[PDB]
Symmetry: C3
Subunit: 285 residues, 3 copies
Amino acid sequence: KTVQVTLHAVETDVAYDNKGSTYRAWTFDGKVPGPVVRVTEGDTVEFTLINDKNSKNSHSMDFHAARLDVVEDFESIKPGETKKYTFTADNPGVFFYHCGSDPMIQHIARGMYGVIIVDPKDANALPKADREYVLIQAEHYENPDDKTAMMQNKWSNVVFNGGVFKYDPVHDSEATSWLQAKPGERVRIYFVNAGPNELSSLHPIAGIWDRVYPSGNPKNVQYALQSYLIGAGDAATLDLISPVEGANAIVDHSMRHAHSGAIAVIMFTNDADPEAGRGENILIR
Amino acid sequence: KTVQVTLHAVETDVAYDNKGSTYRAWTFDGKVPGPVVRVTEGDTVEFTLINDKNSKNSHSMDFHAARLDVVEDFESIKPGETKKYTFTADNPGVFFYHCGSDPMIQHIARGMYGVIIVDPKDANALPKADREYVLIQAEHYENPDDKTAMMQNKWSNVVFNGGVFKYDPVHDSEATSWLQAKPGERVRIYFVNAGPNELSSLHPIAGIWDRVYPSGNPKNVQYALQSYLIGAGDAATLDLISPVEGANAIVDHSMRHAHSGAIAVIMFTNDADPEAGRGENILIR
Amino acid sequence: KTVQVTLHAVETDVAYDNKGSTYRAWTFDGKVPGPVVRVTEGDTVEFTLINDKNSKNSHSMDFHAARLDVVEDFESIKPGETKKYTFTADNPGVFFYHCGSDPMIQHIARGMYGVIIVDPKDANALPKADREYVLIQAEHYENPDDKTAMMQNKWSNVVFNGGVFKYDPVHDSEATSWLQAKPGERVRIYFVNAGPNELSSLHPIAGIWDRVYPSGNPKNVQYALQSYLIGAGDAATLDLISPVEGANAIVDHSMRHAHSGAIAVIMFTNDADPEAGRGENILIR
Ligand SMILES: [Cl-]
Ligand SMILES: [Cl-]
Ligand SMILES: [Cu+2]
Ligand SMILES: [Cu+2]
Ligand SMILES: [Cu+2]
Ligand SMILES: [Cu+2]
Ligand SMILES: [Cu+2]
Ligand SMILES: [Cu+2]
């Protein structure tokens, strides 16, 4: 099918921790991460980027799901301008999207990133998931204007979905969100490492990845992995099943990353919310 | 079968180089790395942790081979307490174990880490190894109390099995240990990257990895790899066969890691000790 | 077949950026990277290294394609000396080669690295490439004598084939080289990450890796990867096909790397130079 996707480049204050601290983010649609885009393998995507008139900077859009021309298609547009391009989603899986404007390190760091999920045309290529969650890792830099700190890799926190310990009520009692499932359910994690700089060594504490798919592609399946390396600008699909009620903690096992905010709790309970990890709830905001 | 495994949390001084430099380590059973645990896929493990009465810190145990509840099973216990849990080893391969107590970066860095090997139920899934050796990479930090330096990734050395150049009598005149095999033999390396922070890019100088199994699982086999990336908190099984007498040097090929201590020599001789890499000589102490 | 490969260890000034900045490089055959070595799986390589009489340092040769003895074969030779050894290329793919002399971090950093390509004996094991390009990533250090800065990972730039933005006319007006292909053609990238220290997260902006081969080996094929991690001292083969005229930009997606020089443009045009990416043009000088 043909789908229309329109996003705004929006520069606005957003919260990055559980105590309400904010920073001047650069975003798609006013939130970090950007909106989940979801299509089927083979779909035509008619994409529109609107750079809001009140932006102070030029912005662009790079989809890792797209095969295009970097110079024309991923070009920067000024505040008040609108850009269109069309691409087919040729390969199934999970893909990073982000602003490609100058300097990319900063546009990514300030929050212009998201995921596009490309469902396999063959609905039987992946085992059926009972829950789906998006987790996007990024570094948070204390001063969004300081490009030198970014070049020097001097981050303040490493986070999932834009918030320090957003999903960790164990380590931060002010956290108000977490992942849910029932024991025995297949939980599918769509993971993107936005960077801009760091790698992630992703591990479910007290669990194991039942299966891992590099770039989300069924052909690349790996089994029973305790951990999986996701480089900067890479993405993978990782399945998790708990045999028991309780919790696992999804961590970036480079411990200084984990301690700085990269931990997400999943609670396994028999009375898990039927809406959790389904529908429009896959990226928990 | 059901296997009983009991470990003590023991805070004690241990050596970290070949000239007898010591640090105040936190350990399982008074040694770094902890005791090798070895079971068969499908086995029931009845585990007991005893936190010694003279410890000054709470400790815990996290097995990457276990599928449990992080909150109750991996909970920290006080000096003088004893904790029990049972798990089945559902997946074959090679798995990191470590203390999970706060802050994990420090409990790992201070020496609370080891390996559990889960032999495949199908003893013919893996090609028969003639020798087996455990190598666990970790960073050593000069001051075990300086958590800031750990968070800044400012390690003093990167080491195998707790010692600077432990197995490198070429670069260290004071080194007395090395790995042994005969030409033509299949040498199986059980490798864990304990971290806490760093990645390892593992290469046998003058050799090639015949096979590499991510998380040690036979289903994930890779062939003829010059190098293999093991992220912090990950493990893999790597096979090596020399066609000639002489040496290879197993290194973390991120050269600043290798030069800081992460080199292990394997000697291939026709008269290799029939006891080396067999029984409980697999982790050379 | 048996092939003779002779290289010289040459210490000489070479350019490392598009404005003609030079440094005192240590090299094979007076250029950085060294000459491309290409043989077929099963071939016998009769190798000779001659250390030039005017060299000030001892040098050696380490082929990741060789299974030998680190002690005797990879030994260092003084200025005016010659080392000879023979090896069979037992495994197909793509392999790092470099000086292995004390300290390896500096010998690599100063330019003593290259690639050996080992074509599969089975001509059909890889899909047929229409273009081939060699890309070797390395860190450039400001002062080639400052070993402490290397040990501390304080690099100035991360580069492909010895040059800051060597193939990026888009981000550097003084860049005079880039990769060329036609739309629809299979472009094969032989990628080596020489390090000495850093990881690469390789991504074609506006494209996708059709296939990736860890160590170049047909047995390890992965499909449709957006990005691929190449550790220090590792190598891989990566195929790229653009369906359209335009450009892709091959980048190390750890952005502080890319912005420091690690970006190579490939131009897809209907009248690409028939000589580009063929014969001995594959490593563009
Ligand atoms: Cl032991
Ligand atoms: Cl045991
Ligand atoms: Cu932007
Ligand atoms: Cu990208
Ligand atoms: Cu502990
Ligand atoms: Cu762990
Ligand atoms: Cu040299
Ligand atoms: Cu090497």
